[PDB]
Design an enzyme around this catalytic site. Structure first.
Site, PDB file in Angstrom:
ATOM      1  N   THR A   5      -7.665  -6.493   6.923  1.00  0.00           N
ATOM      2  CA  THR A   5      -6.644  -5.916   5.971  1.00  0.00           C
ATOM      3  C   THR A   5      -5.294  -5.588   7.161  1.00  0.00           C
ATOM      4  OG1 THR A   5      -8.185  -4.914   5.032  1.00  0.00           O
ATOM      5  CG2 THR A   5      -6.368  -3.752   4.934  1.00  0.00           C
ATOM      6  N   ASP A  31     -11.171  -4.330  -2.808  1.00  0.00           N
ATOM      7  CA  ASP A  31     -11.936  -4.417  -1.577  1.00  0.00           C
ATOM      8  C   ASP A  31     -13.089  -3.611  -1.535  1.00  0.00           C
ATOM      9  OD1 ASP A  31     -11.759  -5.457   1.603  1.00  0.00           O
ATOM     10  OD2 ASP A  31     -11.965  -3.534   1.643  1.00  0.00           O
TER      11      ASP A  31
HETATM   12  C1  LIG Z   1       3.540   1.614  12.143  1.00  0.00           C
HETATM   13  C2  LIG Z   1       3.679   3.047  11.566  1.00  0.00           C
HETATM   14  O1  LIG Z   1       4.781   3.597  11.273  1.00  0.00           O
HETATM   15  N1  LIG Z   1       2.818   4.040  11.886  1.00  0.00           N
HETATM   16  C3  LIG Z   1       1.383   3.731  12.526  1.00  0.00           C
HETATM   17  C4  LIG Z   1       0.462   4.000  11.265  1.00  0.00           C
HETATM   18  N2  LIG Z   1       0.488   5.433  10.975  1.00  0.00           N
HETATM   19  C5  LIG Z   1      -0.402   5.865   9.933  1.00  0.00           C
HETATM   20  C6  LIG Z   1      -0.290   7.270   9.581  1.00  0.00           C
HETATM   21  C7  LIG Z   1      -1.081   7.650   8.529  1.00  0.00           C
HETATM   22  C8  LIG Z   1      -1.848   6.965   7.881  1.00  0.00           C
HETATM   23  N3  LIG Z   1      -2.501   7.461   6.994  1.00  0.00           N
HETATM   24  C9  LIG Z   1      -3.113   6.355   6.064  1.00  0.00           C
HETATM   25  N4  LIG Z   1      -3.452   5.153   6.303  1.00  0.00           N
HETATM   26  C10 LIG Z   1      -4.427   4.499   5.460  1.00  0.00           C
HETATM   27  C11 LIG Z   1      -3.404   3.135   4.752  1.00  0.00           C
HETATM   28  C12 LIG Z   1      -3.926   2.116   4.763  1.00  0.00           C
HETATM   29  N5  LIG Z   1      -2.764   1.456   4.289  1.00  0.00           N
HETATM   30  C13 LIG Z   1      -2.550  -0.143   3.890  1.00  0.00           C
HETATM   31  C14 LIG Z   1      -1.310  -0.455   4.633  1.00  0.00           C
HETATM   32  C15 LIG Z   1       0.126  -0.345   4.203  1.00  0.00           C
HETATM   33  C16 LIG Z   1       1.211  -0.873   5.023  1.00  0.00           C
HETATM   34  C17 LIG Z   1       0.941  -1.357   6.078  1.00  0.00           C
HETATM   35 CL1  LIG Z   1       1.846  -2.274   7.139  1.00  0.00          CL
HETATM   36  C18 LIG Z   1      -0.583  -1.847   6.581  1.00  0.00           C
HETATM   37 CL2  LIG Z   1      -1.009  -2.224   8.173  1.00  0.00          CL
HETATM   38  C19 LIG Z   1      -1.686  -1.300   5.781  1.00  0.00           C
HETATM   39  N6  LIG Z   1      -2.078   2.358   3.843  1.00  0.00           N
HETATM   40  N7  LIG Z   1      -2.387   3.444   4.023  1.00  0.00           N
HETATM   41  C20 LIG Z   1      -2.905   4.739   7.612  1.00  0.00           C
HETATM   42  O2  LIG Z   1      -3.153   3.540   7.925  1.00  0.00           O
HETATM   43  C21 LIG Z   1      -2.131   5.607   8.368  1.00  0.00           C
HETATM   44  C22 LIG Z   1      -1.455   5.152   9.140  1.00  0.00           C
HETATM   45  C23 LIG Z   1       1.881   5.879  10.663  1.00  0.00           C
HETATM   46  C24 LIG Z   1       2.746   5.431  11.738  1.00  0.00           C
HETATM   47 CA   LIG Z   2      -7.728  -5.496   2.984  1.00  0.00          CA
HETATM   48 ZN   LIG Z   3     -12.294  -5.189   3.460  1.00  0.00          ZN
END
Ligand SMILES: CC(=O)N1CCN(c2ccc3ncn(Cc4cn(Cc5ccc(Cl)c(Cl)c5)nn4)c(=O)c3c2)CC1
Ligand SMILES: [Ca+2]
Ligand SMILES: [Zn+2]
Ligand SMILES: *[C@@H]1O[C@H](CO)[C@@H](O[C@@H]2O[C@H](CO)[C@@H](O[C@H]3O[C@H](CO[C@H]4O[C@H](CO[C@H]5O[C@H](CO)[C@@H](O)[C@H](O)[C@@H]5O)[C@@H](O)[C@H](O[C@H]5O[C@H](CO)[C@@H](O)[C@H](O)[C@@H]5O[C@H]5O[C@H](CO)[C@@H](O)[C@H](O)[C@@H]5O)[C@@H]4O)[C@@H](O)[C@H](O[C@H]4O[C@H](CO)[C@@H](O)[C@H](O)[C@@H]4O[C@H]4O[C@H](CO)[C@@H](O)[C@H](O)[C@@H]4O)[C@@H]3O)[C@H](O)[C@H]2NC(C)=O)[C@H](O)[C@H]1NC(C)=O
Ligand SMILES: [Ca+2]
Ligand SMILES: [K+]
Ligand code: NA
Length: 806
Positions: A156, A258
């Site tokens: 993911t 998923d």
């Molecule tokens: C690079 C950056 O600016 N960062 C680092 C990550 N930091 C962060 C803070 C709070 C968070 N809260 C919940 N989640 C779950 C989640 C998973 N996905 C799917 C998804 C969407 C877009 C991408 Cl690009 C990817 Cl890899 C995966 N969406 N949300 C996070 O992972 C999370 C991460 C925020 C600041």
């Molecule tokens: Ca995935």
């Molecule tokens: Zn998975």
């Protein structure tokens, strides 16, 4: 700590300590104001208007509204107009072409909404069609591919961050869902807070690209406890902000299918309902856009990160069944394996002994070990300190684990997963989906499968942005768009070739070579001169010569049967090009020529290889880039033994190369109605996927300056319409290519003790490649001179022949 979210719910800019937060990530940080649930996560009366709510007095406690003022306020339930105003659901309307953006006054550009679905396997678009009407409408009326290829590992976070950056995981840094960085001395995991640290995340993701260029971007992450209905209402509320405050790019993420696919397998009966629920969410979005009069204004991308395979606890390989010493290692387990020493800086840890103990030890072994620099170059999975030196490529449907206790947990060992993902990104079950819908995408159009690294450039095009440097090939996806803002052009040639004539007498050479070529007419002497001056070059160089995109010194050498670009710096061809017709005949190397190597009187002794070095080097032999087996006449065959056609080859690799040249080239000419072949060396000693400079070369033929390639490539082109011969093709082209590792053993091929007909082609298929991959590794640009559009040629260069079934 202190403050209130009144007037602040889902604010776009995140506030710094000690002030409390009200943005869509505050829950993940345990940093929301105390009234965030009360004010921002309203749920009263659910998510749907009913007939009896129509025209209600507004009650601010409600999750969404059916009051007359709700459209003006931007917070109606998404079905408000259907239930209360006699409108139809978006899914029930006929497809109508969107020729131009139809946007409210004040919109400076069509917004982009990225709707990402975790674990959405490509074949759900067919197999689940009857329960996904909204998604099937986006697919059939918009632009779709049959599938989209994810990046490796097919996990993911690597894939979603590739989508956002256009970068391979080895470049953006998110190389797994779990990773250990030996400089940080820290581990990143899907669950937990370490992944919030920006030190892990490299590259420039789309929201930063947009913000730097003055285009406002919503968040792409979402707190998991925010329900999908509230994510959709939040996006729709942001779309109602004043022009100067309103984002232009939005992202919705769904953890389904998923989440259920892991529990129930990709096609478990339990999977129908998650597909139904995602489809309903798409319908809420489209209905909500239609109420805002944005449904013929916004571009929507519906995209997944990876597919899902059947995987059960009992299909686990245990390293403890191979290694006596399994407590000395750390394994990142699962659908891939990454191995490092348990004790860092421990000098009594031998990766060579570990690889050996894992190599071809059980007949049906369901993983294969690699040093990371030996993995197929198409995976682009090595140039990062977070990628362990030892890698296990695991067979689809299987897991690898260190010890049985890691899998069978107390009390007695129940399993409770049936699906997983992570395998090689060419595996059919790992393929995912792409649909684009809106004014800028084409209408009712199918496009061929493509790689998710390409989408960042397209999303930048859709937003008027200049993309940050990335691994897409900008223009290769122009055929997805109705209106393109990017006009690709070929890179300028940097080095121009020399065209040497006959300049050296035989006795000037002291190469230690011999050849029995003294054997044995004015008619055929002119013909020979014409061939050396290029008279057959239009047969054998069908798409123009490759351009050299870096500073070097090289010569073009013409022959009856092949043309080459010969490097005076690396002392061998950078490329060798030749055409083999369907009618071509294979011949032997005559007995008297077995060890023939001939000085090339066009090329100085000082810029030639020498046979003495090969005699002295007891590990290293040589082969030829244009194969003597495919000479057009006994007289032309002498050209194939020129010193300028010779390259260093390990005897083990010569088994592979000779079978390719003697058997497979002619087979492909037979099957494809002729082929054009361009072959050459690659030097990538630092495994960064890019052509090495001469001062990066770590191995030479003993006692010489002849550098040893790390890989050998071939690009095999023919006519897409195979009723036309490769050399007389009027239309689009068809290509397959490979980048074979130049290894001194065939330990990668467990059946290599058998005849080559039983294992060489399987090896070549594993090492299939895009033309683009070869371009990065050689600094060459191919297909300079065709009748095809350059955008079409860019698509051709990104093609990968995967050898999967349909
Ligand atoms: C690079 C950056 O600016 N960062 C680092 C990550 N930091 C962060 C803070 C709070 C968070 N809260 C919940 N989640 C779950 C989640 C998973 N996905 C799917 C998804 C969407 C877009 C991408 Cl690009 C990817 Cl890899 C995966 N969406 N949300 C996070 O992972 C999370 C991460 C925020 C600041
Ligand atoms: Ca995935
Ligand atoms: Zn998975
Ligand atoms: C896929 O596409 C990508 C993107 O184009 C290609 O990757 C690029 O490849 C080039 C060539 O190798 C590489 O070049 C330069 O790197 C050094 C600068 O690096 C740091 O800054 C980068 C730019 O940041 C700015 O712009 C970006 C926009 O993209 C913003 O995001 C930034 O915020 C900022 O505004 C930055 O991108 C880079 O990021 C890397 O490192 C981060 C911290 O570790 C990490 O978080 C990232 O994930 C990323 O990590 C990857 O890249 C590094 C290599 O940079 C790898 O080691 C990692 O494993 C991982 O793969 C950095 O923060 C610059 O110093 C280099 O210049 C030296 O070398 C050149 C020739 O190579 C020479 O001419 C110079 O003189 C100079 O030499 C001197 O220094 C060296 C030591 O470096 C020394 O030995 C010597 O003696 C001299 O003293 C070089 O110009 C890009 O960094 C890289 N970009 C990315 C994002 O990876 C990739 O090749 C392509 N893949 C394929 C197969 O085609
Ligand atoms: Ca390199
Ligand atoms: K030798
Ligand atoms: Na072997």
């Amino acid at each position: 700590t202190s403050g209130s979210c009144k007037g602040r719910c889902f604010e776009l800019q995140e506030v710094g300590p000690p002030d409390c937060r009200c943005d869509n990530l505050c829950k993940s940080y345990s940093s929301c104001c105390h009234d965030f649930d009360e004010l921002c996560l309203k749920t009263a009366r659910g998510w749907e208007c009913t007939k009896d709510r129509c025209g209600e007095v507004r009650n601010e406690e409600n999750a969404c509204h059916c009051s007359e003022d709700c459209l003006s306020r931007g917070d109606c339930c998404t079905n408000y107009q259907v239930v209360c105003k006699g409108e139809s659901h978006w899914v029930d309307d006929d497809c109508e072409e969107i020729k131009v953006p139809e946007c409210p006054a004040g919109f400076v550009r069509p917004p982009l909404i990225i709707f990402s679905v975790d674990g959405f396997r490509a074949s759900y678009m067919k197999k689940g069609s009857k329960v996904m009407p909204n998604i099937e409408k986006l697919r059939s009326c918009g632009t779709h591919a049959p599938y989209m290829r994810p990046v490796y590992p097919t996990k993911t976070f690597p894939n979603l961050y590739t989508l956002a950056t256009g970068l391979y995981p080895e470049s953006h840094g998110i190389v797994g869902n779990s990773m250990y960085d030996p400089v940080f001395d820290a581990s990143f995991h899907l669950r937990g807070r370490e992944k919030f640290n920006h030190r892990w995340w490299g590259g420039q993701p789309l929201w930063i690209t947009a913000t730097k260029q003055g285009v406002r971007a919503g968040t792409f992450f979402w707190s998991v406890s925010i329900p999908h209905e509230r994510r959709i209402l939040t996006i729709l509320q942001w779309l109602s902000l004043p022009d100067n405050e309103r984002p232009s790019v939005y992202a919705f993420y769904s953890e389904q299918p998923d989440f259920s696919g892991h529990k129930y397998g990709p096609f478990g009966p339990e999977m129908t309902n998650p597909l139904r629920e995602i489809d309903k969410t798409v319908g809420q979005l489209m209905d909500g856009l239609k109420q805002l009069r944005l449904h013929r204004c916004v571009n929507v991308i519906f995209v997944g990160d990876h597919g899902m395979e059947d995987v059960t606890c009992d299909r686990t390989e245990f390293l403890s069944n191979y290694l006596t010493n399994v407590d000395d290692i750390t394994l990142v387990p699962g659908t891939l394996g990454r191995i490092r020493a348990k004790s860092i800086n421990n000098s009594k840890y031998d990766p060579k002994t570990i690889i050996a103990a894992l190599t071809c030890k059980k007949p049906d072994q369901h993983f294969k070990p690699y040093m990371k620099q030996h993995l197929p170059k198409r995976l682009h999975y090595a140039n990062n300190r977070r990628i362990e030196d030892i890698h296990l490529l695991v067979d689809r449907r299987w897991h690898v684990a260190r010890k049985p206790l890691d899998v069978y947990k107390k009390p007695s060992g129940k399993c409770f997963f049936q699906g997983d993902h992570g395998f090689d990104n060419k595996v059919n079950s790992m393929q995912t989906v792409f649909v684009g819908y809106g004014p800028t995408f084409k209408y009712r159009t199918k496009v061929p499968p493509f790689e998710n690294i390409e989408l960042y450039n397209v999303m930048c095009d859709l937003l008027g942005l200049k993309p940050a440097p990335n691994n897409g090939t900008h223009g290769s996806l122009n055929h997805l768009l109705r209106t393109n803002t990017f006009r690709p052009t070929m890179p300028d040639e940097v080095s121009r070739p020399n065209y040497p004539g006959i300049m050296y007498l035989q006795s000037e050479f002291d190469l230690g070579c011999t050849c029995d070529d003294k054997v044995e007419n004015k008619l055929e002497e002119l013909n020979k001169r014409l061939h050396t001056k290029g008279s057959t070059k239009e047969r054998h160089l069908l798409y123009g010569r490759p351009a050299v995109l870096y500073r070097t010194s090289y010569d073009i050498l013409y022959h009856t049967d092949f043309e080459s670009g010969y490097s005076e710096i690396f002392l061998m061809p950078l490329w060798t090009s030749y055409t083999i017709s369907k009618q071509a005949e294979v011949s032997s190397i005559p007995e008297h020529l077995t060890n023939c190597v001939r000085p090339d009187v066009r090329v100085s002794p000082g810029f030639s290889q020498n046979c003495l070095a090969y005699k002295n080097d007891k590990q290293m032999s040589y082969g030829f880039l244009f194969p003597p087996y495919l000479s057009s006449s006994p007289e032309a065959k002498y050209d194939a033994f020129l010193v300028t056609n010779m390259v260093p080859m390990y005897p083990a690799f010569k088994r592979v190369w000779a079978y390719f040249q003697r058997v497979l080239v002619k087979k492909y000419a037979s099957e494809r109605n002729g082929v054009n072949v361009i072959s050459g060396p690659i030097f990538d000693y630092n495994y960064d996927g890019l052509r090495d400079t001469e001062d990066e070369i770590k191995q030479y033929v003993e006692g010489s300056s002849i550098p040893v390639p790390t890989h050998y490539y071939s690009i095999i082109t023919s006519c897409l319409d195979f009723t036309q011969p490769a050399d007389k093709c009027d239309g689009p082209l068809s290509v397959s290519s490979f980048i074979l590792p130049h290894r001194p053993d065939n330990d990668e091929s467990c059946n290599s003790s058998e005849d080559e007909s039983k294992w060489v082609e399987e090896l070549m298929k594993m090492h299939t490649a895009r033309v683009r991959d070869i371009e990065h590794l050689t600094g060459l640009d191919f297909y300079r001179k065709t009748s095809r559009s350059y955008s079409e040629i860019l698509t051709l260069k990104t093609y990968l022949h995967t050898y999967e079934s349909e």
